[PDB]
């Protein structure tokens, strides 16, 4: 989902990374 | 089995079943598993009885959930209620608490379109 | 050994200014690698044409901030005298570092 508030490409759409996304 | 006193998430994934439990979402579901070494794959129609109490009593006693949770949900309102904060008088008229556009939609809290 | 940079807007006065620098250093000193244009970093600015309101038919220009590079090896005595004196800058911002 492009709008699920807890997903892979969920953050790829809102400009952020978060937990569900490999940060540094 | 009858997990949270009344809710009975049978015949379905051990992980997902717990989500259906009120007060227990997806994360708190992966939480009982790693802290009880339970495999997320298996079901509820073929789990050991030990775990029917092991995993159960675990979350039941671990953190707030069930009707008691909702009560707190319902309580935190009465506080914003008795005095009249800007957040509280939103549940009154039933408006949103994000200060969002009431002019356009916002139906989800407003209710179905009442033309008049 | 030494290295000179050549940023600038006009490109006709940036193939000229880098071209004079190539003939003066070679004709009166040791080897000097030719002009090496760096990827022109260009600015772009679109903006609504109308004074008031017309979300279209707008306009936009570009800032051609060029780039050019010449590298000399031998710090000759004739060349450093040729560069110091003989040079025709203009709208070119050079920066030399050893």
């Amino acid at each position: 989902g492009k709008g699920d508030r807890r997903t892979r490409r969920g953050k790829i759409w809102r400009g952020t990374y978060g937990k569900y996304r490999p940060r540094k | 089995a009858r997990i949270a006193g009344v809710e009975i998430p049978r015949n379905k994934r051990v992980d997902v079943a717990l989500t259906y439990i009120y007060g227990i979402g997806k994360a708190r579901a992966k939480e009982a598993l790693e802290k009880t070494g339970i495999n997320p794959a298996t079901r509820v129609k073929d789990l050991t009885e030990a775990e029917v109490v092991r995993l159960r009593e675990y979350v039941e006693n671990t953190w707030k959930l069930e009707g008691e949770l909702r009560a707190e949900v319902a309580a935190n309102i009465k506080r914003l209620m008795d005095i009249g904060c800007y957040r509280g008088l939103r549940h009154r008229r039933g408006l949103p608490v994000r200060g969002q556009r009431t002019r356009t939609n916002a139906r989800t809290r407003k209710g179905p379109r009442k033309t008049v | 050994k030494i290295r000179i940079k050549l940023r600038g807007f006009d490109h006709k006065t940036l193939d000229a200014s880098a071209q004079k620098i190539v003939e003066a250093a070679r004709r009166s000193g040791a080897q000097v690698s030719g002009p090496i244009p760096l990827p022109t970093r260009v600015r772009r600015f679109t903006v609504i044409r109308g004074p008031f309101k017309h979300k279209d038919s707008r306009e936009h220009f570009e800032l051609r901030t060029h780039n050019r590079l010449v590298d000399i090896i031998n710090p000759n005595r004739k060349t450093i005298e040729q560069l110091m004196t003989l040079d025709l800058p203009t709208g070119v911002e050079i920066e030399i570092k050893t």
Binding site: - | - | T46, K55, D56, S57, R58, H60
Partner: protein, 127 residues
């Protein structure tokens, strides 16, 4: 000895080194069937070699870069025609009519203002 040409398309160029061999085809590392995996278009690129009738008789070291995945393959398609047309005059008299020698002008088109995609207008109305 070697055969060379230059494939290019969508700013996704592709150098083409190719000396006669068994059929091995390293390109930006990886074997041919290794890099391009689960993508039907691939088996096409090697068509020029099937036009010359020499599948398992020409190794190839191609250096492709830039552009998307598939666009690459297209650049590969032409680099090989150029490669096997350079060191071979008589292999153009038949490879050209079948068509292989063309840059393929079909580049993405610039997006224009007052539109969303150089073309797709915002939902027209009147109300």
């Amino acid at each position: 000895e070697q055969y060379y040409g230059t494939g290019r398309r969508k700013e996704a160029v592709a150098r083409v080194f190719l000396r006669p061999g068994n059929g091995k085809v390293t390109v930006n590392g990886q074997d041919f069937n290794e890099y391009f995996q689960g993508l039907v278009r691939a088996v096409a690129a090697l068509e020029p070699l099937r036009a010359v009738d020499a599948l398992g008789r020409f190794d190839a070291y191609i250096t492709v870069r830039g552009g998307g995945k598939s666009g690459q393959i297209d650049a590969i398609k032409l680099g090989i025609a150029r490669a096997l047309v350079q060191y071979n005059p008589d292999y153009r008299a038949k490879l050209k009519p079948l068509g292989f020698l063309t840059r393929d002008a079909r580049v993405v088109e610039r997006k224009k203002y007052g539109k969303h995609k150089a073309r797709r207008a915002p939902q027209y109305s009147k109300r």
